[PDB]
Amino acid sequence: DIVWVEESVSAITLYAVWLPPRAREYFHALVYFVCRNAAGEGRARFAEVSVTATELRDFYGSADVSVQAVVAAARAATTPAASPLEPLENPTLWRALYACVLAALERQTGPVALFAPLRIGSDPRTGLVVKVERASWGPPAAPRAALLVAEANIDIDPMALAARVAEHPDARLAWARLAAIRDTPQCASAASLTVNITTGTALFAREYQTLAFPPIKKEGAFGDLVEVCEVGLRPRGHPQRVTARVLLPRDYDYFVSAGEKFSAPALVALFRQWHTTVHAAPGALAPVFAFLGPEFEVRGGPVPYFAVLGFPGWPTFTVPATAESARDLVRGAAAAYAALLGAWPAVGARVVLPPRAWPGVASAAAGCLLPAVREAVARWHPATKIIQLLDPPAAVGPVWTARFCFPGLRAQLLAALADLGGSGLADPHGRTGLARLDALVVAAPSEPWAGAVLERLVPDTCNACPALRQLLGGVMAAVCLQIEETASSVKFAVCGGDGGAFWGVFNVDPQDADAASGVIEDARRAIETAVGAVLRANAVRLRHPLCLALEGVYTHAVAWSQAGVWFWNSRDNTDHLGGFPLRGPAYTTAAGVVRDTLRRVLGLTTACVPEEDALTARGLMEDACDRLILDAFNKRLDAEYWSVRVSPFEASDPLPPTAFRGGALLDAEHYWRRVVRVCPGGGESVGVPVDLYPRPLVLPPVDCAHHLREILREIELVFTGVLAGVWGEGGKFVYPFDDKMSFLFA
Amino acid sequence: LDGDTAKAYLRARTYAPGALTPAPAYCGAVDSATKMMGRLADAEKLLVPRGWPAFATCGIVKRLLRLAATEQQGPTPPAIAALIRNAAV
């Protein structure tokens, strides 16, 4: 006799993480379900889980973490006024915590799925969800949203940022700010924070000079957005009746924040104020104040996100810029939330499998393969490329060339190998995380939102399990071997590539095009079929049937380095350049100059002795360099144009002591540091972090005698490759920048 | 250098057109090395917030020459306007 309802779960958040009595190595966690029934009406629900120590150490990847540490972190996060920003101590701890609580939620209660129909039960005697089951009836309500804008001037003292950056050098400045709030929470009490959440029913806007103080401008009310709900619960951990206050999000479902100037400290401060306001009255339990994002780690992260691990229980999606297709990225964020249960991108690679169950699956996948690939996996050394390719100083043409790619081969191969090791998993029900990856791979061609997930879930998974790289690159090595074997039969000739993407030539007469399409299509058919056959023979089965993409037909192709290739189809003048670093806005203009110079220099096929062509080519390359440096002068004062994106891994210029004064601008720095080298006074070249100063900027003249030298360096690399690849070798194209056209800037 | 680049190189590397044209009064920064040293630092205090690195009788001349050479970015007042204290500079 269990109650039964019909609802869709819109979010799953963490309320309490406690250690029951007579307990040493298992902690209970209460989960807040934001359920909404048909037509949008929302009733709040709760469930309980029980995570053991072993599961925690599995999702952490190490035994350093303990149940006591997790419970202490949760207790610290119980109060945001005393100490917010709890995850910043051990971000991996909270990452693993959310991973295991979601896994236990899936295991004990049953299958859960956001924004999807779900039959839900409850036990009144205790008062929590007991079992969740996938339903098959109902046109569920649309996942409504609310647009949030929040800006705060948290008066952080610059010297503290400088000191904390001195302790850890390559600390992304958002982490420096966030650590400053963490070490002095009173700073989050005084800030000119402004908030404007617009919904479809009623708007809400507030303005503060000091956060704790009453607003200096009101609009709507807190009650229009929130329906504060007091729910009684009797967990197995708590025998006494425990009451919980939750902020049911009426009208909306999730938040949509612009990622252009998103400040994680701003939302942290606003949510801390809301937490204090709602849980000020006692007689009820307090929730977990936990948030994660790329700003929460020293070295930062690629993809902007803002996790909501606890209070208020509403997912908030940062959609960076992309104004033209704002709805597209909002839908992509919503789909990423719904599919991977909202763990992505906060939990990390643990959405699929625990970081420590992978060493078993990889071993269990090295056994079900064929005997040859079994060794091929074991002999994989970084960048082996055991396949007949071209010497990197070389070029081809005029012959019918073609580029091919298998869309999402690493992700599809990882999915097949995960299934091969699936039998080796401890729990058959613990393979639901292995159902999200297949959902991603299946929906990858249909919708690009799965794409960006798979281009980051896979490389990060390969870092979670180092042993998976030698497996994936062995399977791909086997794929390349059969590509080469089948190539000879269809006149295709492997000339270069990087595995899933490969470009080659055809031994057809280089003048006929009517039959060219036929051979170019038969080669695709045969290569696709043969690779699929090898994969099937290797037992690895792909969910989405394999497909080869004809990414372009070209007549000339020139390669200089291992990644640098330029293709050009003379008939339609369609070209493609790869391997040129786009490390700024000037490198794009350099790439365009290169792709025009190469188009003009391979148009010199007029009958001539090879020696003549080398000189009439070098002259044109020097002229192209001239026209580039001439146009460089007309943009000498655009410092943002002469900017380079330094990674937190690369060696970086030292931060000026005045860049620590950007206010609500230091938060934007999550991954890249955009630096411009200016030349104050004389002789000395100093770096300016462009995005840490207010605009319009005032600077000494930009040292174009440094950036143009590097741009020219890579241009001469490409030009030396083409000069020594089409005609006779022996010529390193150098442009005398220091003499011919140095005067313009220095 | 032919075209708009000639006009660009001219203004960029020559005294402004209306800088050597007889004007009824003067407009600039005239002070002894000791006073101008302080005024240069004071100008940098209003110049540092937006990009100019801190320079913590040759240093003074080098800094003044660098300030004078810095060019106007669109309609925004030039960098030396902090010291000369006029928007028509």
Automatic annotation (TrEMBL), chain B:
Signal peptide: none annotated. This is Helicase-primase primase subunit. It comes from Human herpesvirus 1 (HHV-1). The lineage of its organism: Viruses, Duplodnaviria, Heunggongvirae, Peploviricota, Herviviricetes. The chain holds residues 425 to 529 of 1058 of the full protein.
